[PDB]
Design a protein around this ligand. Structure first.
Ligand SMILES: [Cl-]
Length: 101
């Protein structure tokens, strides 16, 4: 039965994503936001240790979404793919849902 996704935060600032993610305990806790610096593009923000890493959601010519190489017909599919394939080329970081107040 259909629930909204807990990871879509709309237009929050980059800094505010960092503020909220810093309070999460578990690496991989993440959100998708609408970039303020590149209106029309999404960014993915992810907790890792005491840092928060940011990734550009890239588009191909057909409008598919990707981070690195594998691309998807939806942000939803990109998110889910990266729950079991690392978002980072430097660490093993897998997307997991934020805790939630
Ligand atoms: Cl992996």
């Amino acid at each position: 039965e259909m629930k909204p996704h807990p990871w879509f935060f709309g237009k929050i600032p980059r800094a505010k994503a960092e503020e909220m993610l810093s309070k999460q305990r578990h690496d991989g806790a993440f959100l998708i936001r609408e970039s303020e610096s590149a209106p029309g593009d999404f960014s993915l923000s992810v907790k890792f240790g005491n840092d928060v890493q940011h990734f550009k959601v890239l588009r191909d010519g057909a409008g598919k979404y990707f981070l690195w190489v594998v691309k998807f017909n939806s942000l939803n599919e990109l998110v889910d793919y990266h729950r079991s394939t690392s978002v980072s080329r430097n660490q093993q970081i897998f997307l997991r849902d934020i805790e939630q107040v």
